[PDB]
Each structure stands twice: as structure tokens, then as C-alpha cells.
Amino acid sequence: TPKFKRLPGHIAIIPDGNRRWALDRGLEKHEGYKHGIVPGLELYDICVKIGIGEVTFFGFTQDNTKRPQIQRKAFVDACIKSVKELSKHDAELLVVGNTNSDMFPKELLAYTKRTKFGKGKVRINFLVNYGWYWDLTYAFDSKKMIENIASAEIPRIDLLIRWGGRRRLSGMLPVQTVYSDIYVVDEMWPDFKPEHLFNALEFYQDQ
Amino acid sequence: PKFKRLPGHIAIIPDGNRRWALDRGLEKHEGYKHGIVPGLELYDICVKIGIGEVTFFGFTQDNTKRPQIQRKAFVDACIKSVKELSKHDAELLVVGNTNSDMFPKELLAYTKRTKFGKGKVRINFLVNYGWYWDLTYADSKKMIENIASAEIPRIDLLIRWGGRRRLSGMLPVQTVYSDIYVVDEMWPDFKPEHLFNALEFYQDQ
Numbered sequence: 393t394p395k396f397k398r399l400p401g402h403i404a405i406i407p408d409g410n411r412r413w414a415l416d417r418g419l420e421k422h423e424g425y426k427h428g429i430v431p432g433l434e435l436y437d438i439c440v441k442i443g444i445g446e447v448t449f450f451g452f453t454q455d456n457t458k459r460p461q462i463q464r465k466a467f468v469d470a471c472i473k474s475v476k477e478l479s480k481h482d483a484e485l486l487v488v489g490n491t492n493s494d495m496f497p498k499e500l501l502a503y504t505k506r507t508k509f510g511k512g513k514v515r516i517n518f519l520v521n522y523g524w525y526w527d528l529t530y531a532f533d534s535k536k537m538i539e540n541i542a543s544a545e546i547p548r549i550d551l552l553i554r555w556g557g558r559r560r561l562s563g564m565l566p567v568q569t570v571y572s573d574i575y576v577v578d579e580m581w582p583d584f585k586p587e588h589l590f591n592a593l594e595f596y597q598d599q
Numbered sequence: 600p601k602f603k604r605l606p607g608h609i610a611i612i613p614d615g616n617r618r619w620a621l622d623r624g625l626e627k628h629e630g631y632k633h634g635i636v637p638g639l640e641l642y643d644i645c646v647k648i649g650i651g652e653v654t655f656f657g658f659t660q661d662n663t664k665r666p667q668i669q670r671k672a673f674v675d676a677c678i679k680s681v682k683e684l685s686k687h688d689a690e691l692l693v694v695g696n697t698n699s700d701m702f703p704k705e706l707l708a709y710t711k712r713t714k715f716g717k718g719k720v721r722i723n724f725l726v727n728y729g730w731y732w733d734l735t736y737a738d739s740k741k742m743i744e745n746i747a748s749a750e751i752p753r754i755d756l757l758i759r760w761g762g763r764r765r766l767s768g769m770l771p772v773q774t775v776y777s778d779i780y781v782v783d784e785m786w787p788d789f790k791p792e793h794l795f796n797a798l799e800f801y802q803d804q
């Protein structure tokens with residue numbers, strides 16, 4: 393951990409590129425997701441160590457659920473597993489997504505209220521069956537409207553880091569990302585390395 | 600230069616006018632006048648290559664709290680840009696909070712989309728704009744279709760000068776899926792190749 397002058401209060405993670413990573417290894421597209429779990433736990437461990445107070449992971453969107461059944465089952469399975477694993481750490485977990493849907497995994501409804509595990513050293517939010525349109529329309533007092541979006545328990549994002557080399561938000565939290573610094577890692581998510589985060593934090597503070 | 604694929608709608612964030620001015624030994628507010636010709640030149644290239652729609656980020660509600668000398672200069676630059684484009688076949692729309700003393704009265708003529716000349720391209724300007732004002736302007740199915748910026752469609756490619764990698768609250772709804780290209784050079788140092796570089800990136804996505 394370098395000697396940061398400043399850290400983001402809240403980091404957003406877009407763990408993109410699981411299918412490309414799988415194909416590059418001669419695996420089926422759906423086999424990449426299971427290789428994205430340990431990168432998530434590694435990223436949390438570093439966040440806890442350097443003092444990041446809040447991380448939001450983009451888990452999957454409603455549009456993601458139109459992918460073939462074999463992909464949907466693999467990425468939902470890996471999301472549930474990621475949350476289960478994170479609950480054996482010191483994380484205050486919140487899952488945000490459209491629960492009024494057969495595409496919302498029932499195993500994750502338990503975490504739609506923020507749940508402190510062990511010492512609760514870092515807030516971790518997970519977007520599960522998330523959609524920007526669902527999020528903004530949930531609100532329907534118009535000045536309150538923003539305070540009543542589905543994702544209102546998720547605060548403003550300081551720094552958004554995206555793996556897989558695409559420079560775009562894919563509709564992650566349009567309200568919380570208005571002013572976010574955006575750092576894009578070319579490597580696919582399962583090729584996560586600590587220096588990816590350190591490079592993003594160096595960028596954030598030299599800003 | 601030839602492109603396999605062109606975006607339907609480009610967003611521009613012309614940031615870095617004050618840094619550009621300071622670096623040239625000028626006063627902070629002197630950068631804005633030097634951002635007009637870059638805008639007109641971008642417009643010309645877009646007409647030439649056939650881009651159908653371009654949205655410029657002019658200024659935010661927050662930007663109006665800057666020293667008067669800076670605000671007058673950037674407001675004056677935005678008015679001149681709109682006036683100039685209206686002489687050259689732009690279909691112009693200005694979006695911003697008109698229920699504000701900081702909305703430039705000279706741009707009230709453009710709050711409903713107006714075809715000038717052949718209307719070769721739709722040019723949008725955000726002037727006295729805020730994301731929060733935009734979304735709250737607004738069934739809920741209807742209400743997102745009634746955000747203040749509702750006449751501005753989805754953005755395919757957003758290009759930002761000045762090296763900052765953020766949206767600064769530009770059109771949160773229309774930028775959800777936008778590919779983002781950041782030019783490190785300040786807006787007044789605009790070159791055609793900046794735009795060509797962004798378009799090569801887009802076609803590679």
C-alpha cells in the first residue's frame with residue numbers, strides 16, 4: 393500500500409470481461425464468472441487494508457438476464473457465491489436490485505437490508521438484477537424523488553474502476569456516477585491484480 | 600479519413616479553457632473566446648464526415664458561481680457559438696434552466712429545436728444545465744420521457760477535452776451506455792485528429 397494523500401470515500405467496480413477471459417483460456421463463455429469471485433475478495437481485502445470505506449460492485453443488470461440460460465445461471469451463481477464469501481469477512485453488505493422479478497436470486501433477498509458481518513470494516517454494495525431505468529423510476533415531492541431512487545442507500549461514487557477495457561458506465565448508478573473519476577483497466581476482471589487498484593488510486597489522488 | 604462505423608450522436612465536453620489560458624500566460628477568463636473556433640471546426644468536420652447529432656456541454660448551474668469575469672466570458676462564448684452555428688445549416692436546440700437569471704436571454708430563441716439553412720446536423724447546447732434540475736423536471740414511464748433534456752437522445756460517444764475522465768453530470772440518462780474518449784489537451788488546442796482518434800476508438804468498440 394503506497395502513502396496516499398487522499399483516498400476515494402466510495403469506489404465503484406465494473407468487473408467486466410469474464411466471457412472474453414474464458415474464451416481466451418479455451419473455456420465456455422459461462423465458465424469465466426467463477427474466476428471473478430477471488431478477484432472480488434482480493435479487491436475487498438486490499439480496500440480494508442488501505443482504508444477504503446465503501447465499494448459498490450456491479451453484479452448484473454436486468455439486460456444481462458436476457459443472455460442464454462447457461463450464462464445467467466453461471467453469473468447468478470458467482471454473484472451469490474461472492475456475497476456468501478464476503479459475509480465471512482468484516483463487510484457491511486447491501487444488495488440493490490429489482491426484487492419484484494423472477495430474475496432476482498432469492499438467496500440474495502436476505503441482503504437487501506444492509507447487514508454487518510464480523511467487524512463491518514467496509515460497506516460493500518452489490519447491484520443484482522439492477523437497471524438504471526428501474527432505479528430512477530422507483531422514485532415515483534419531486535425534490536425528494538432523487539432521495540427515493542431504488543439505490544438511494546448507495547452514496548455518490550468518487551472513483552469508478554472498470555476492467556475489460558470498455559470506457560462506459562453500462563447504466564451503473566447514473567445519479568451516483570455524475571462526477572465520478574473513471575479509470576479503465578484493459579485486462580479482463582479475472583486477470584485482476586493489486587496494481588490495477590493502486591494505479592486507479594494514484595490517478596484519483598493526482599486529480 | 601474513412602470510418603467503418605460512425606456514432607449517431609456525439610457529446611462534447613469542452614473543458615480546460617482556464618488551464619489553457621493560464622499556460623499561455625493569459626488571464627483565466629481569456630480561454631473561452633479561443634474555444635469558439637474549435638466548436639465551429641468540430642461542427643464542420645461532423646457535417647463533412649456525416650455525424651447526425653452533436654451535444655456540447657456549454658455550462659452548468661454550478662459554473663455560474665465562478666467570478667463574474669469568467670462567467671461573462673464563457674456565457675459570451677456560448678452565445679457566439681450558437682449564433683455562428685445558426686448561420687451554417689445547424690438544427691439548434693439549447694437545453695438549460697430558463698427559470699433562472701443565469702440563463703442567457705439571447706438563447707431563449709433556441710429552447711425549441713430550430714432548423715437553420717439545410718439543417719445538415721442537430722446541434723444541442725447545455726446552458727445553465729444541472730443533472731438534478733434535468734431529472735427532477737419530471738406515469739413514471741412518462742416521467743423519464745419528460746426530463747428537461749428529453750429532446751436530446753441517447754449519446755453513442757462522449758469526447759472530453761482537458762484530460763479529466765468524468766461526466767461532470769452531463770445528461771445522466773443519455774450517457775448510461777456512451778463510450779467515453781478523453782483527449783488530454785485542453786479544448787482550445789482542439790485538432791481534427793482528436794475527433795478522428797475518438798471515432799477510431801468508437802468503431803473499434
Ligand SMILES: CC(C)=CCC/C(C)=C/CC/C(C)=C/COP(=O)(O)OP(=O)(O)O
Pocket residue numbers: 407408409410411412413425426428429431432449450451452453456466467468470471474556
Ligand atoms: C465481484 C463479482 C461480481 C464476482 C462475480 C463475477 C460476476 C458474476 C460478474 C458480473 C456479471 C457480468 C455481466 C460480468 C461482465 O462480464 P461479461 O459477461 O459481460 O463478459 P464480456 O464483457 O467479456 O462479454
Ligand SMILES: CC(C)=CCC/C(C)=C/CC/C(C)=C/COP(=O)(O)OP(=O)(O)O
Pocket residue numbers: 613614615616617618619631634635637638655656657658659662672673674676677680761
Ligand atoms: C460549447 C462551446 C464550444 C462554447 C465555447 C467555449 C465555452 C463557453 C466553454 C464552456 C464553459 C466551461 C465551464 C468550460 C470548461 O473549461 P473550464 O473553465 O472548466 O477550464 P479548466 O478546466 O481549465 O478550469
Ligand code: DMA
Pocket residue numbers: 406407408450451452453456558560561562776
Ligand atoms: C454488470 C456488468 C459487469 C456489466 C458490464 O458489462 P455488460 O457486458 O453488461 O455491458 P456493456 O455491454 O455495456 O459492455
Ligand code: DMA
Pocket residue numbers: 571612613614656657658659662763765767
Ligand atoms: C460545462 C463543461 C465544459 C464542463 C466542464 O466541467 P467543470 O470544469 O465545470 O467540471 P469538473 O470540475 O467536474 O471538471
Ligand SMILES: [Mg+2]
Pocket residue numbers: 408409
Ligand atoms: Mg461485458
Ligand SMILES: [Mg+2]
Pocket residue numbers: 614615761
Ligand atoms: Mg473545468
